[PDB]
Structure formats: C-alpha cells, structure tokens
Amino acid sequence: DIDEFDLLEGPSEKTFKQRRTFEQRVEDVRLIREQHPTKIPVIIERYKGEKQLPVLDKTKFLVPDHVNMSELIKIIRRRLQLNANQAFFLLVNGHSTPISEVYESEKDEDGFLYMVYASQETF
Amino acid sequence: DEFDLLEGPSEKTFKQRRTFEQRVEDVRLIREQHPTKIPVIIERYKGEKQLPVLDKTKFLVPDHVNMSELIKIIRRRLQLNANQAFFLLVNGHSVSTPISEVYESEKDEDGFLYMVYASQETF
Amino acid sequence: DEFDLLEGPSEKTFKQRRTFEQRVEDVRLIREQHPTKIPVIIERYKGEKQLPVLDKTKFLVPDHVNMSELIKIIRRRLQLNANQAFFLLVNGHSMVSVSTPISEVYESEKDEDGFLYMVYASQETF
Amino acid sequence: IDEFDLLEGPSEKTFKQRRTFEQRVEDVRLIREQHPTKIPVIIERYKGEKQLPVLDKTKFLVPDHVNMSELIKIIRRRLQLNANQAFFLLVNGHSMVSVSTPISEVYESEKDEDGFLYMVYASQETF
C-alpha cells in the first residue's frame, strides 16, 4: 500500500493576472515606475505545462533597466539553483538586449512585462 | 504585494566592453572613411536615477552639428517629455559650438569623444 | 468610510497617440492655413497633484504672443491667482523668464515633427 | 461508430469582437510608428467556410511594395492551395480579384476607423 504513491489532486495553478486585479496591477506599476524610473516591473512565471523546472519563490520582480536578457536568464537560473546541464528558456510573448527595450516593446496593458520560463523553446 | 528587486552585474562602461586597441582601430577606420564625422560615445551617467538607457553607445555625429542640436537629438532618441531635465557632459562639462571643435579639444587618447548624460548638471 | 481612488491605465501623451508622420502632416496643414500662428502641444506634468488639467492639448499661439503673455494666458485658463506656483517647461527648461516672441521659441525649440512641446507643473524640478 | 459526431464549442469571436475599439487603434498606432512602410491587415476566414483551411494568425503586416495581386498569391500558397482552388479575398463587401493596386492605396481608401484594413477569404465570391 505504501509501496505506491497517491497523487493529491490539487487546484489549478493560477497565473499572476488571475491572482491580482488589473487595477491593483496598474496601481502597482504606476507607483513603482514613478519612484523607480530606471527599473522594469517584470512578472516571471513557470510555463503551465512545464514538468522539469522547479517553481520560483516569487513572481513579481524589479529589474534594473541596464540588465539584458542574457544576464536576466543567469539570475533566474541561480534563483532556481539549476545545475549546468538543466535547460532553461525565458519567453516574452512566446519568443525566446537590454530589458528596457524589451519592456518598451512588449509590456502589458497593465504596465508589467510578462515572461514565462520552461525547459523547452516550444509552445 | 511587494516587488523583489533583482540586481544584475555591474553596468560596465564602453572602455570596459572594448579594449583600447580595438577602440583605436575603430576610430582609425571611421575617420579615414568619414573624415567629416565625429566618433562619439554617449553613456548614461553611472548614478543616474531618472533618465532611461540609450539603445546604442557608439555614434557618428556630422562635424557641423553643435552641442545644442546634439542634445535635442538625444532627448528625442530617449523620447523625453518637455519637463524632463537632460544634461550632456564632456569631461564633466555641461552651447552653439560645432562638435568638431569639441572633438579637437576633448577627445580621448583612443580617438573617441566621450559624453555622459544625466538629469543633473554637476556631480 | 475611506475613499478608493479609481485609476485606469496610463493615459498616453500626444506623441504616443499620433505617429510622427501624422504629426508632420498635422503641422504642415496648420502652418499652411494659419501662417501667423505657432502649433504648440501643452500637457500637464504626469505627476501633478495641484494644478487642474486643460480640456485640450493642441493649441495655436498667435505670433504676436510673447512668452510672458503666453504664461498669463495659461495661468488664467487654470484660474490661478498671482500666489500659486506655475512653471512652463520646454525641452527641460522652465520658461518663466523669457518674455520673448513665440516665433523665436518655436524656431529654437520646436520638435522634429514641427510641434513645440510644453509641459506645465507646480514645480520647477523633478 | 458508423458516423462521426461533430465537436464544437461556442461561436468563435472575430478580431473586432475580441479587441475593443481602443486596443485596435492603439495596436495600429504602435505598429505604424514602428513600421512606417508596412500596412496592418486583419485577414480572417469566412465564418461558414468549409473548403479552405484556417490560417494560424489573424494580424498581418503587408509591405508597401506588395500589390493586391501579389498579396492574393501570398495567401494562396500560405494556405498551401492547389492550382484549382477557388480563392476570393473580400474587402468591404468587394472581391479584390482583379485589383492589383498597391496595398497602401487600398489601405487609405478601405481601412477601418480603427486603422486596420479588414479582409475575409473564402472559396466562394458571393453569399
């Protein structure tokens, strides 16, 4: 009996936007941008169908505008404590340079830049 | 609820991303090929907290452009609003003179003209 | 019991609501039709907490208006008395002092798109 | 077991139904500031179309050097059609078949108030 596991069916993983109202997200960005004008408000979440990489401990981040995607990837890799073999991809609008430029092009209606990470470059 | 601020690697200067010999060679070709254009480095001041980062660092400025015209060009590349202060410092110095005269007085050992911009005049 | 502030997404600036080519064609039409008037964008500072907003953003300033007269015009649209602080900023510089023809300001300060951009606020530095 | 049973969800919403007349204008404003030589076009399959396949995307950029005849030919091989297949591209109720005028002229006369040029494709020319 205790040779076998019982998987507990849990609730669905919920995204940041369903965890926080759009007005709270706009007030979040508005306050953080007036007071930290050189830092980009970034949402980083695990791809919903991801089954190799662990979950990050936080979701809402502020990234200095001089940080590029390659440096950001390395930061998230140590936060997840990945080993050198583990694959990691960070997707903005499904697509795998300084973040401020990504921010100006891809930021959300609510002012956040949304990113999704996975162990594959795929959809 | 609160943001988690990610700090990245140090903002490293142009002289830190390119060796003195590569920079010397950069100038030598561009001045041999564009004798009437000034090779200019424009970087955001190190402790700058309000202005955004520029997308490029290495610029060519026609030799007849004056400092006042260059400031307006940079203000518009940064998409600044009319209220936003902007100062362009050459060797710490913040005008109706042609860039070619500034180039002859202030150019670096490597042949580049170095400029730093900030929202404050002096530091 | 407490007030709750209703905010939407950031309202966009004039340059964010109209392309560079639409603005150039805006200016070319208005300069062909009003040869003695200067096209000026006047917007309230994004973080302004004291001065009211104007209904309009796109303005024509007759060439006989100097900077001192223009300041008084905008102050009186805002219904300020002589007491209240008011600053009108062009390319990062507040223009209280100038009291100069609008055509000179336009020719020295206009944007590449042909508009002269101004921001007003109750503070001079940010 | 002899016959197939059709799987269907609620009616799919068109682009104009999935996007308010603010998200669409604001889309055009960024894309036209950023790609001044490309025309923003919505291309959707006729809602009752039973012959032509669906495209993966709805929002397209057409370079200004593309004329209507070349655009049709682009969509036809994007759909991987045979040489037969009837294919008609309709704008504001009109079949674009023998137009061949530059896309920017089509755009300026036929664009929507929101700034998109709307097109629908089908294997029939009338409805």
Swiss-Prot record, chain B:
Pfam families assigned: ATG8
Descriptive protein name: Microtubule-associated protein 1 light chain 3 beta
Species in which this protein is naturally found: Homo sapiens
Keywords: Autophagy, Cytoplasm, Cytoplasmic vesicle, Cytoskeleton, Lipoprotein, Membrane, Microtubule, Mitochondrion, Phosphoprotein, Ubl conjugation, Ubl conjugation pathway
Lineage: Eukaryota, Metazoa, Chordata, Craniata, Vertebrata
Location in the cell: Cytoplasmic vesicle, Autophagosome membrane; Endomembrane system; Mitochondrion membrane; Cytoplasm, Cytoskeleton
Modification comment: The precursor molecule is cleaved by ATG4 (ATG4A, ATG4B, ATG4C or ATG4D) to expose the glycine at the C-terminus and form the cytosolic form, LC3-I. The processed form is then activated by APG7L/ATG7, transferred to ATG3 and conjugated to phosphatidylethanolamine (PE) phospholipid to form the membrane-bound form, LC3-II. During non-canonical autophagy, the processed form is conjugated to phosphatidylserine (PS) phospholipid. ATG4 proteins also mediate the delipidation of PE-conjugated forms. (Microbial infection) The Legionella effector RavZ is a deconjugating enzyme that hydrolyzes the amide bond between the C-terminal glycine residue and an adjacent aromatic residue in ATG8 proteins conjugated to phosphatidylethanolamine (PE), producing an ATG8 protein that is resistant to reconjugation by the host machinery due to the cleavage of the reactive C-terminal glycine. RavZ is also able to mediate delipidation of ATG8 proteins conjugated to phosphatidylserine (PS).
Function: Ubiquitin-like modifier involved in formation of autophagosomal vacuoles (autophagosomes). Plays a role in mitophagy which contributes to regulate mitochondrial quantity and quality by eliminating the mitochondria to a basal level to fulfill cellular energy requirements and preventing excess ROS production.
Resulting phenotype, residue 120 to P: Abolished delipidation by ATG4 family proteins
Annotated GO CC locations: autophagosome; autophagosome membrane; axoneme; cytoplasmic vesicle; cytosol; endomembrane system; microtubule; mitochondrial membrane
A single GO BP: autophagy
Membrane topology value: Lipid-anchor
Quaternary structure, from the entry: 3 different light chains, LC1 (a cleavage product of MAP1B), LC2 (a cleavage product of MAP1A) and LC3 (produced by one of the MAP1LC3 genes), can associate with the MAP1A or MAP1B heavy chains. Interacts at microtubules with CABP1 (via EF-hands 1 and 2) but not with calmodulin. Interacts with FYCO1 (via C-terminus). Interacts with TP53INP1 and TP53INP2. Interacts with TBC1D25. Directly interacts with SQSTM1; this interaction leads to MAP1LC3B recruitment to inclusion bodies containing polyubiquitinated protein aggregates and to inclusion body degradation by autophagy. (Microbial infection) Interacts with Hantaan hantavirus glycoprotein N; this interaction contributes to the virus-induced degradation of mitochondria by autophagy, which leads to degradation of host MAVS and inhibition of type I interferon (IFN) responses.
